[PDB]
Amino acid sequence: IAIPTNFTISVTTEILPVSMTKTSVDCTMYICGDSTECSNLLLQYGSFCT
Amino acid sequence: LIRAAEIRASANLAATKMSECVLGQSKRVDFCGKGYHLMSFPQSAPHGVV
Amino acid sequence: PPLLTDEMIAQYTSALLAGTITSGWTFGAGPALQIPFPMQMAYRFNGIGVTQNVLYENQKLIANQFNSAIGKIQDSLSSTPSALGKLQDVVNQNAQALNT
Amino acid sequence: IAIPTNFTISVTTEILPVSMTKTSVDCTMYICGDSTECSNLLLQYGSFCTQLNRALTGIAVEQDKNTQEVFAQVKQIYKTPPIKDFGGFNFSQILPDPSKPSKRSPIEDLLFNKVTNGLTVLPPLLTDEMIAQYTSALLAGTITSGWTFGAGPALQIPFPMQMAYRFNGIGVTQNVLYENQKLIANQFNSAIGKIQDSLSSTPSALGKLQDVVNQNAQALNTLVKQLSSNFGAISSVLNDILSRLDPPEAEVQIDRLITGRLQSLQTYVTQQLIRAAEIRASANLAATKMSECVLGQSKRVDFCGKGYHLMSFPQSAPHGVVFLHVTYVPAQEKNFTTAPAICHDGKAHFPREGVFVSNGTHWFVTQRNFYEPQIITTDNTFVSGNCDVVIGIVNNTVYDPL
Amino acid sequence: FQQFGRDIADTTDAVRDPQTLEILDITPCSFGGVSVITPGTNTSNQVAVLYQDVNCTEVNVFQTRAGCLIGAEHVNNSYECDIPIGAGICASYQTSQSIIAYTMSLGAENSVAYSNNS
Numbered sequence A: 001i002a003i004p005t006n007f008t009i010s011v012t013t014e015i016l017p018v019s020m021t022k023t024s025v026d027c028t029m030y031i032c033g034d035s036t037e038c039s040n041l042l043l044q045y046g047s048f049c050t
Numbered sequence B: 001l002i003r004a005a006e007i008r009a010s011a012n013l014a015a016t017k018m019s020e021c022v023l024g025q026s027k028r029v030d031f032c033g034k035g036y037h038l039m040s041f042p043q044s045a046p047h048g049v050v
Numbered sequence C: 001p002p003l004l005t006d007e008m009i010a011q012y013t014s015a016l017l018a019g020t021i022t023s024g025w026t027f028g029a030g031p032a033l034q035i036p037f038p039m040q041m042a043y044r045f046n047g048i049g050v051t052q053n054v055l056y057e058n059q060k061l062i063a064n065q066f067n068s069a070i071g072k073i074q075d076s077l078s079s080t081p082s083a084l085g086k087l088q089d090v091v092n093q094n095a096q097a098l099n100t
Numbered sequence D: 001i002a003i004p005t006n007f008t009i010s011v012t013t014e015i016l017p018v019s020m021t022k023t024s025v026d027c028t029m030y031i032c033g034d035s036t037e038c039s040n041l042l043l044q045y046g047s048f049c050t051q052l053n054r055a056l057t058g059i060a061v062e063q064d065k066n067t068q069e070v071f072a073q074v075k076q077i078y079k080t081p082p083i084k085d086f087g088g089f090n091f092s093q094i095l096p097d098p099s100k101p102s103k104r105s106p107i108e109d110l111l112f113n114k115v116t117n118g119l120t121v122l123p124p125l126l127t128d129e130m131i132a133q134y135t136s137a138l139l140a141g142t143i144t145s146g147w148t149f150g151a152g153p154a155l156q157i158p159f160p161m162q163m164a165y166r167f168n169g170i171g172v173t174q175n176v177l178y179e180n181q182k183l184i185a186n187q188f189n190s191a192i193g194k195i196q197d198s199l200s201s202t203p204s205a206l207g208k209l210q211d212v213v214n215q216n217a218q219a220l221n222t223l224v225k226q227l228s229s230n231f232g233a234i235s236s237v238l239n240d241i242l243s244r245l246d247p248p249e250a251e252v253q254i255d256r257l258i259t260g261r262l263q264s265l266q267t268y269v270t271q272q273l274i275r276a277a278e279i280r281a282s283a284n285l286a287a288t289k290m291s292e293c294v295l296g297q298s299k300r301v302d303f304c305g306k307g308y309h310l311m312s313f314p315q316s317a318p319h320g321v322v323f324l325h326v327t328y329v330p331a332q333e334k335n336f337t338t339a340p341a342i343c344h345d346g347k348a349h350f351p352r353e354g355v356f357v358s359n360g361t362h363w364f365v366t367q368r369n370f371y372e373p374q375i376i377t378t379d380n381t382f383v384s385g386n387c388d389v390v391i392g393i394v395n396n397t398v399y400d401p402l
Numbered sequence E: 001f002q003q004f005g006r007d008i009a010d011t012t013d014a015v016r017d018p019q020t021l022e023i024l025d026i027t028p029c030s031f032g033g034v035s036v037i038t039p040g041t042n043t044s045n046q047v048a049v050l051y052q053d054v055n056c057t058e059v060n061v062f063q064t065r066a067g068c069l070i071g072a073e074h075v076n077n078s079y080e081c082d083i084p085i086g087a088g089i090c091a092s093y094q095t096s097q098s099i100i101a102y103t104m105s106l107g108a109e110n111s112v113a114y115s116n117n118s
């Protein structure tokens, strides 16, 4: 049998992600940028935006 | 959405590790580094913990 | 912008560190109870099957090893070849997605 | 050093979603409702409807498996004895109520009362009565056997003795229980009553269980509302399109409608998949909690409520489960002057289990979680070394029991 | 002056007859899926059909909450679930041989002997 006669104290690190960057994209502005005609055309698709 | 699910899982793991390893002493093997666990300290980091 | 700022995160971490150092594990369960740090470390050794004689006779050696290990950790954290890859990959992925 | 001199018994609550609502959607009937031309045109697209149906069937089977693995943890079904002499503890607020129908506990009744076109819903495999029978079996087995029924064959044990075991499991001598049985029973009953009263009073008691249902209903409502969009066609109604336009030109309009509705179905199915994955993760966590916390006693910190864990009891709820963690927490403390070791005749004495302490005139040794002084003898300490290495050692006299 | 009613989800569910002013209610006629319950073809070749969420008039006919079951004989016993159907009803190929629909049994009844001395 083997029995230790001495010891050491060791310190290690550990990295974990927690959160990402909050973001928000304007649906209507991205698709139809400042265009009444484009907005009117898009209004016929329904709830693909909300 | 798919990436946010993974980030949430990692955050839950980090919270469990903090609660079980900083506020007490854990007997689970390799959960808090190699060897027999004594204590641990947290450090903040950009969008993560150490 | 995030709800919690870096100063608040640092305040939480400092509170946790001070509570741990000055109370062991009592503050996580109930009211905080003070305890000398050598005695707390004696309890920690007692929790892994080593009697308190070892600590109470090798206090100086253990303290020296602790300080040396902390210094080594700081040096490695500085002069390591990008160990913080996990926190960088997320930013890279988000930037690539937004750019595309 | 600070040592508590009194304790309080506390009961908390935890709510976890387990299962979703099983649903199925007929792709062909949704896209084209009784239209031969629309069906023929849709036939030239492939196996999208089959893929969607397979995904939904997988979701339903996963929900059934989740509920089964969460609740079916016991091999047999136990029953509480007709007598209720549990050492003074009162369990009438969690055991099944025989007088009222459906055989549910009053807390379960309060929990149940709080939450109150090609689309079909399938009934769950396990009914509320069967879930209640599982919960009652688990509760009775726990009450009458501790953890032996989960470890192996069930073995009986008096409840005060089981509580003495549990106190011994967190570093407190069973002496304390055998002295303060009445106080502990009163505190337990009062805590149970407070939980019963507070649950109804607090409005946001079942926020997660309400949120899941709200999300599912909103998704179904927006899916069924999307059916009334032009998608760039002349009209959004197929019979009128057919009656107005010519056969050569109606094909374009029907194609636009089919494209829009297929895209809507695909989006709905993807959202359902993601939500089902999240619900499965929650159900796995709940199953782990049940196994490691009801059928045994766990030393993990903050895994079974705040404080030192003693026991917990399960309660059923609509599409979820509720736990009642029972924990031990120190209350009232003073502070003293401590010392690491003691010198008697050039030898150093260390505590066997405990910590040295003094009030200013005499030195004693107690436990760690309760003030209980004892006289210092050779049965409390063990000798190791001499009086020259330890830092902070203190002169004293060690009594000899011989 | 109201002609026809509507639903919360904008669905026509009430119409007044023009010639004779009177309120009528509209509900779509029944529809549902069809499922086949079979053991292994190696074991046998007899099958049963479950008509989902349809009332046993539009088609050994048995009635469940899941739907209308055809080809399975009800029994009084209780066995472990083999082929789940819904609402605690399971079917299996058991002895002669036929297909039986029953109510699943959770487990064996037990009662531990408890007293304040044992």
Ligand SMILES: *[C@@H]1O[C@H](CO)[C@@H](O[C@@H]2O[C@H](CO)[C@@H](O)[C@H](O)[C@H]2NC(C)=O)[C@H](O)[C@H]1NC(C)=O
Pocket: D006, D007, D008, D183, D186, D187
């Ligand atoms: C320890 O705390 C308990 C309360 O948790 C104390 O019991 C109370 O004692 C007072 C005074 O005797 C009574 O008025 C209360 O009714 C008791 N509470 C209950 C629930 O019975 C107990 O006295 C405390 N012990 C010490 C030594 O301080």
Ligand SMILES: *[C@@H]1O[C@H](CO)[C@@H](O[C@@H]2O[C@H](CO)[C@@H](O)[C@H](O)[C@H]2NC(C)=O)[C@H](O)[C@H]1NC(C)=O
Pocket: D090, D091, D092, D093
């Ligand atoms: C366990 O608690 C219940 C209440 O939670 C006790 O039942 C009460 O008994 C008193 C005295 O007979 C009545 O005035 C109350 O109306 C009862 N309440 C209910 C809800 O029934 C019960 O007595 C307790 N157990 C024991 C052994 O005393």
Ligand SMILES: *[C@@H]1O[C@H](CO)[C@@H](O[C@@H]2O[C@H](CO)[C@@H](O)[C@H](O)[C@H]2NC(C)=O)[C@H](O)[C@H]1NC(C)=O
Pocket: D359, D360, D361, D362
């Ligand atoms: C510290 O504890 C000791 C042990 O109880 C106390 O000594 C006792 O004091 C009372 C008076 O309050 C005497 O009646 C006993 O005879 C004493 N015991 C012994 C063995 O002599 C001591 O008083 C406590 N210290 C303080 C400041 O109260």
Ligand SMILES: *[C@@H]1O[C@H](CO)[C@@H](O)[C@H](O)[C@H]1NC(C)=O
Pocket: D333, D334, D335
């Ligand atoms: C700690 O001790 C000091 C002096 O002995 C006393 O004033 C103080 O109240 C004690 N702390 C507590 C929490 O009782």
Ligand SMILES: *[C@@H]1O[C@H](CO)[C@@H](O)[C@H](O)[C@H]1NC(C)=O
Pocket: D391, D392, D393
């Ligand atoms: C505690 O610290 C003080 C100040 O550093 C010191 O004077 C005292 O000797 C210490 N206690 C012991 C037991 O050495």
Ligand SMILES: *[C@@H]1O[C@H](CO)[C@@H](O)[C@H](O)[C@H]1NC(C)=O
Pocket: D343, D394, D395
């Ligand atoms: C403890 O006892 C030894 C025995 O001689 C003595 O030399 C020493 O001074 C004592 N400790 C203190 C702090 O006086």
Ligand SMILES: *[C@@H]1O[C@H](CO)[C@@H](O)[C@H](O)[C@H]1NC(C)=O
Pocket: E018, E019, E020, E021
């Ligand atoms: C239409 O004529 C019939 C024949 O008498 C009559 O009964 C009915 O009331 C008429 N409709 C209306 C709206 O008056």
Ligand SMILES: *[C@@H]1O[C@H](CO)[C@@H](O)[C@H](O)[C@H]1NC(C)=O
Pocket: E055, E056, E057
């Ligand atoms: C189902 O069928 C039975 C038998 O005719 C009938 O009594 C009952 O009303 C029906 N239920 C529905 C909802 O149609």
Ligand SMILES: *[C@@H]1O[C@H](CO)[C@@H](O)[C@H](O)[C@H]1NC(C)=O
Pocket: E074, E075, E076, E077
């Ligand atoms: C029990 O059997 C009787 C006749 O043997 C039958 O009428 C009854 O429907 C059966 N009940 C069940 C629940 O199988």
